PDB file of all heavy atoms in Angstrom:
ATOM      1  N   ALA A 102      25.145 103.690-100.037  1.00  0.00           N
ATOM      2  CA  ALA A 102      24.423 104.048-101.180  1.00  0.00           C
ATOM      3  C   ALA A 102      25.236 104.767-102.278  1.00  0.00           C
ATOM      4  O   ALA A 102      25.158 104.483-103.492  1.00  0.00           O
ATOM      5  CB  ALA A 102      23.162 104.869-100.832  1.00  0.00           C
ATOM      6  N   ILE A 103      26.067 105.702-101.826  1.00  0.00           N
ATOM      7  CA  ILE A 103      26.937 106.476-102.743  1.00  0.00           C
ATOM      8  C   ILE A 103      27.960 105.556-103.450  1.00  0.00           C
ATOM      9  O   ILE A 103      28.170 105.643-104.597  1.00  0.00           O
ATOM     10  CB  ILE A 103      27.692 107.624-102.028  1.00  0.00           C
ATOM     11  CG1 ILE A 103      26.635 108.838-101.738  1.00  0.00           C
ATOM     12  CG2 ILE A 103      28.871 108.213-102.908  1.00  0.00           C
ATOM     13  CD1 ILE A 103      27.152 109.844-100.775  1.00  0.00           C
ATOM     14  N   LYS A 104      28.604 104.610-102.666  1.00  0.00           N
ATOM     15  CA  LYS A 104      29.344 103.539-103.232  1.00  0.00           C
ATOM     16  C   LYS A 104      28.726 102.758-104.251  1.00  0.00           C
ATOM     17  O   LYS A 104      29.306 102.510-105.275  1.00  0.00           O
ATOM     18  CB  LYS A 104      29.936 102.681-102.150  1.00  0.00           C
ATOM     19  CG  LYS A 104      30.347 103.264-100.951  1.00  0.00           C
ATOM     20  CD  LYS A 104      31.775 103.203-100.702  1.00  0.00           C
ATOM     21  CE  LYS A 104      32.087 102.981 -99.251  1.00  0.00           C
ATOM     22  NZ  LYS A 104      32.642 104.132 -98.458  1.00  0.00           N
ATOM     23  N   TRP A 105      27.511 102.333-104.022  1.00  0.00           N
ATOM     24  CA  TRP A 105      26.702 101.548-105.021  1.00  0.00           C
ATOM     25  C   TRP A 105      26.523 102.288-106.345  1.00  0.00           C
ATOM     26  O   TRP A 105      26.647 101.709-107.397  1.00  0.00           O
ATOM     27  CB  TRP A 105      25.341 101.232-104.485  1.00  0.00           C
ATOM     28  CG  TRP A 105      25.167  99.822-103.992  1.00  0.00           C
ATOM     29  CD1 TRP A 105      25.953  99.224-103.105  1.00  0.00           C
ATOM     30  CD2 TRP A 105      24.098  98.997-104.226  1.00  0.00           C
ATOM     31  NE1 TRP A 105      25.449  97.958-102.806  1.00  0.00           N
ATOM     32  CE2 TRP A 105      24.257  97.779-103.464  1.00  0.00           C
ATOM     33  CE3 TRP A 105      22.945  99.076-105.066  1.00  0.00           C
ATOM     34  CZ2 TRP A 105      23.467  96.674-103.550  1.00  0.00           C
ATOM     35  CZ3 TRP A 105      22.038  97.996-105.121  1.00  0.00           C
ATOM     36  CH2 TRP A 105      22.327  96.834-104.435  1.00  0.00           C
ATOM     37  N   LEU A 106      26.205 103.589-106.216  1.00  0.00           N
ATOM     38  CA  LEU A 106      26.053 104.442-107.376  1.00  0.00           C
ATOM     39  C   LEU A 106      27.337 104.756-108.105  1.00  0.00           C
ATOM     40  O   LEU A 106      27.301 105.208-109.276  1.00  0.00           O
ATOM     41  CB  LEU A 106      25.274 105.727-106.986  1.00  0.00           C
ATOM     42  CG  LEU A 106      23.868 105.633-106.450  1.00  0.00           C
ATOM     43  CD1 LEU A 106      23.407 106.955-105.905  1.00  0.00           C
ATOM     44  CD2 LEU A 106      22.858 105.098-107.433  1.00  0.00           C
ATOM     45  N   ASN A 107      28.440 104.490-107.449  1.00  0.00           N
ATOM     46  CA  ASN A 107      29.765 104.640-108.085  1.00  0.00           C
ATOM     47  C   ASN A 107      30.368 103.287-108.592  1.00  0.00           C
ATOM     48  O   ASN A 107      30.801 103.266-109.690  1.00  0.00           O
ATOM     49  CB  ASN A 107      30.722 105.349-107.115  1.00  0.00           C
ATOM     50  CG  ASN A 107      30.385 106.768-106.707  1.00  0.00           C
ATOM     51  OD1 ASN A 107      29.620 107.441-107.502  1.00  0.00           O
ATOM     52  ND2 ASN A 107      30.891 107.276-105.635  1.00  0.00           N
ATOM     53  N   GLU A 108      30.277 102.295-107.769  1.00  0.00           N
ATOM     54  CA  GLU A 108      30.866 101.030-108.121  1.00  0.00           C
ATOM     55  C   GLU A 108      30.190 100.378-109.288  1.00  0.00           C
ATOM     56  O   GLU A 108      30.794  99.700-110.082  1.00  0.00           O
ATOM     57  CB  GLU A 108      30.877 100.114-106.877  1.00  0.00           C
ATOM     58  N   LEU A 109      28.902 100.555-109.349  1.00  0.00           N
ATOM     59  CA  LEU A 109      28.084 100.021-110.409  1.00  0.00           C
ATOM     60  C   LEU A 109      27.616 101.096-111.389  1.00  0.00           C
ATOM     61  O   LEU A 109      27.859 102.248-111.157  1.00  0.00           O
ATOM     62  CB  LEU A 109      26.850  99.271-109.815  1.00  0.00           C
ATOM     63  CG  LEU A 109      27.061  98.595-108.490  1.00  0.00           C
ATOM     64  CD1 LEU A 109      25.717  98.172-107.882  1.00  0.00           C
ATOM     65  CD2 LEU A 109      27.904  97.272-108.690  1.00  0.00           C
ATOM     66  N   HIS A 110      26.905 100.672-112.465  1.00  0.00           N
ATOM     67  CA  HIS A 110      26.620 101.587-113.537  1.00  0.00           C
ATOM     68  C   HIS A 110      25.259 102.255-113.345  1.00  0.00           C
ATOM     69  O   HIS A 110      24.153 101.735-113.557  1.00  0.00           O
ATOM     70  CB  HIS A 110      26.591 100.823-114.813  1.00  0.00           C
ATOM     71  N   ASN A 111      25.343 103.484-112.784  1.00  0.00           N
ATOM     72  CA  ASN A 111      24.110 104.208-112.421  1.00  0.00           C
ATOM     73  C   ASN A 111      23.064 104.361-113.567  1.00  0.00           C
ATOM     74  O   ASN A 111      23.388 105.014-114.551  1.00  0.00           O
ATOM     75  CB  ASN A 111      24.466 105.584-111.813  1.00  0.00           C
ATOM     76  CG  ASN A 111      23.332 106.141-110.976  1.00  0.00           C
ATOM     77  OD1 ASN A 111      22.291 105.510-110.790  1.00  0.00           O
ATOM     78  ND2 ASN A 111      23.600 107.313-110.425  1.00  0.00           N
ATOM     79  N   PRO A 112      21.915 103.747-113.364  1.00  0.00           N
ATOM     80  CA  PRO A 112      20.855 103.867-114.383  1.00  0.00           C
ATOM     81  C   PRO A 112      19.895 104.981-114.042  1.00  0.00           C
ATOM     82  O   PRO A 112      18.965 105.276-114.785  1.00  0.00           O
ATOM     83  CB  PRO A 112      20.170 102.530-114.283  1.00  0.00           C
ATOM     84  CG  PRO A 112      20.392 102.061-112.901  1.00  0.00           C
ATOM     85  CD  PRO A 112      21.773 102.565-112.536  1.00  0.00           C
ATOM     86  N   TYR A 113      20.083 105.590-112.875  1.00  0.00           N
ATOM     87  CA  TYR A 113      19.079 106.512-112.315  1.00  0.00           C
ATOM     88  C   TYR A 113      19.426 107.940-112.734  1.00  0.00           C
ATOM     89  O   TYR A 113      20.528 108.426-112.539  1.00  0.00           O
ATOM     90  CB  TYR A 113      19.095 106.476-110.801  1.00  0.00           C
ATOM     91  CG  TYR A 113      18.809 105.065-110.170  1.00  0.00           C
ATOM     92  CD1 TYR A 113      19.807 104.383-109.459  1.00  0.00           C
ATOM     93  CD2 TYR A 113      17.577 104.509-110.361  1.00  0.00           C
ATOM     94  CE1 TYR A 113      19.508 103.142-108.921  1.00  0.00           C
ATOM     95  CE2 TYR A 113      17.306 103.262-109.829  1.00  0.00           C
ATOM     96  CZ  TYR A 113      18.240 102.590-109.099  1.00  0.00           C
ATOM     97  OH  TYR A 113      17.916 101.361-108.597  1.00  0.00           O
ATOM     98  N   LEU A 114      18.411 108.632-113.300  1.00  0.00           N
ATOM     99  CA  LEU A 114      18.536 110.059-113.527  1.00  0.00           C
ATOM    100  C   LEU A 114      18.518 110.971-112.308  1.00  0.00           C
ATOM    101  O   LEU A 114      19.065 112.030-112.295  1.00  0.00           O
ATOM    102  CB  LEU A 114      17.530 110.581-114.574  1.00  0.00           C
ATOM    103  CG  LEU A 114      17.504 109.841-115.945  1.00  0.00           C
ATOM    104  CD1 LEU A 114      16.819 110.682-117.036  1.00  0.00           C
ATOM    105  CD2 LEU A 114      18.948 109.509-116.403  1.00  0.00           C
ATOM    106  N   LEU A 115      17.895 110.453-111.283  1.00  0.00           N
ATOM    107  CA  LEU A 115      17.859 111.114-109.971  1.00  0.00           C
ATOM    108  C   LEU A 115      17.871 110.065-108.889  1.00  0.00           C
ATOM    109  O   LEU A 115      17.297 108.931-109.069  1.00  0.00           O
ATOM    110  CB  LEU A 115      16.603 111.976-109.752  1.00  0.00           C
ATOM    111  CG  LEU A 115      16.516 113.266-110.572  1.00  0.00           C
ATOM    112  CD1 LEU A 115      15.006 113.744-110.525  1.00  0.00           C
ATOM    113  CD2 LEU A 115      17.462 114.361-110.211  1.00  0.00           C
ATOM    114  N   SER A 116      18.517 110.347-107.800  1.00  0.00           N
ATOM    115  CA  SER A 116      18.705 109.465-106.644  1.00  0.00           C
ATOM    116  C   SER A 116      18.172 110.155-105.376  1.00  0.00           C
ATOM    117  O   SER A 116      18.879 111.028-104.773  1.00  0.00           O
ATOM    118  CB  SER A 116      20.096 109.011-106.510  1.00  0.00           C
ATOM    119  OG  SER A 116      20.459 108.093-107.541  1.00  0.00           O
ATOM    120  N   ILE A 117      16.939 109.837-105.027  1.00  0.00           N
ATOM    121  CA  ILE A 117      16.291 110.393-103.907  1.00  0.00           C
ATOM    122  C   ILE A 117      16.668 109.689-102.579  1.00  0.00           C
ATOM    123  O   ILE A 117      16.471 108.465-102.457  1.00  0.00           O
ATOM    124  CB  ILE A 117      14.707 110.379-104.027  1.00  0.00           C
ATOM    125  CG1 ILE A 117      14.288 111.182-105.264  1.00  0.00           C
ATOM    126  CG2 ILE A 117      14.031 110.852-102.757  1.00  0.00           C
ATOM    127  CD1 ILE A 117      13.051 110.658-106.000  1.00  0.00           C
ATOM    128  N   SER A 118      17.219 110.389-101.583  1.00  0.00           N
ATOM    129  CA  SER A 118      17.524 109.785-100.305  1.00  0.00           C
ATOM    130  C   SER A 118      16.339 109.883 -99.376  1.00  0.00           C
ATOM    131  O   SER A 118      15.908 110.935 -98.892  1.00  0.00           O
ATOM    132  CB  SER A 118      18.697 110.588 -99.696  1.00  0.00           C
ATOM    133  OG  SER A 118      19.154 109.940 -98.449  1.00  0.00           O
ATOM    134  N   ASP A 119      15.771 108.698 -99.085  1.00  0.00           N
ATOM    135  CA  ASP A 119      14.582 108.600 -98.245  1.00  0.00           C
ATOM    136  C   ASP A 119      14.936 107.893 -96.937  1.00  0.00           C
ATOM    137  O   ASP A 119      14.551 106.763 -96.765  1.00  0.00           O
ATOM    138  CB  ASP A 119      13.500 107.850 -98.995  1.00  0.00           C
ATOM    139  CG  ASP A 119      12.176 107.829 -98.216  1.00  0.00           C
ATOM    140  OD1 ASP A 119      11.926 108.753 -97.488  1.00  0.00           O
ATOM    141  OD2 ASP A 119      11.414 106.823 -98.331  1.00  0.00           O
ATOM    142  N   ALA A 120      15.762 108.604 -96.134  1.00  0.00           N
ATOM    143  CA  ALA A 120      16.507 107.854 -95.097  1.00  0.00           C
ATOM    144  C   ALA A 120      15.568 107.391 -93.949  1.00  0.00           C
ATOM    145  O   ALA A 120      15.903 106.437 -93.257  1.00  0.00           O
ATOM    146  CB  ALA A 120      17.598 108.805 -94.508  1.00  0.00           C
ATOM    147  N   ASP A 121      14.449 108.114 -93.788  1.00  0.00           N
ATOM    148  CA  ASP A 121      13.532 107.668 -92.679  1.00  0.00           C
ATOM    149  C   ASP A 121      12.311 106.961 -93.313  1.00  0.00           C
ATOM    150  O   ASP A 121      11.471 106.505 -92.564  1.00  0.00           O
ATOM    151  CB  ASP A 121      13.046 108.959 -91.986  1.00  0.00           C
ATOM    152  CG  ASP A 121      14.184 109.708 -91.346  1.00  0.00           C
ATOM    153  OD1 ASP A 121      15.079 109.104 -90.718  1.00  0.00           O
ATOM    154  OD2 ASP A 121      14.250 110.992 -91.441  1.00  0.00           O
ATOM    155  N   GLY A 122      12.210 106.880 -94.608  1.00  0.00           N
ATOM    156  CA  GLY A 122      11.206 106.061 -95.311  1.00  0.00           C
ATOM    157  C   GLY A 122       9.857 106.728 -95.417  1.00  0.00           C
ATOM    158  O   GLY A 122       8.875 106.098 -95.799  1.00  0.00           O
TER     159      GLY A 122
END
Side-chain angles (χ1 to χ4, degrees), residues 102-107 109 111-122:
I103 287 165
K104 329 243 217 248
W105 260 49
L106 297 171
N107 294 340
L109 327 164
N111 200 359
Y113 302 114
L114 301 201
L115 292 164
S116 288
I117 298 149
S118 186
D119 185 31
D121 300 316

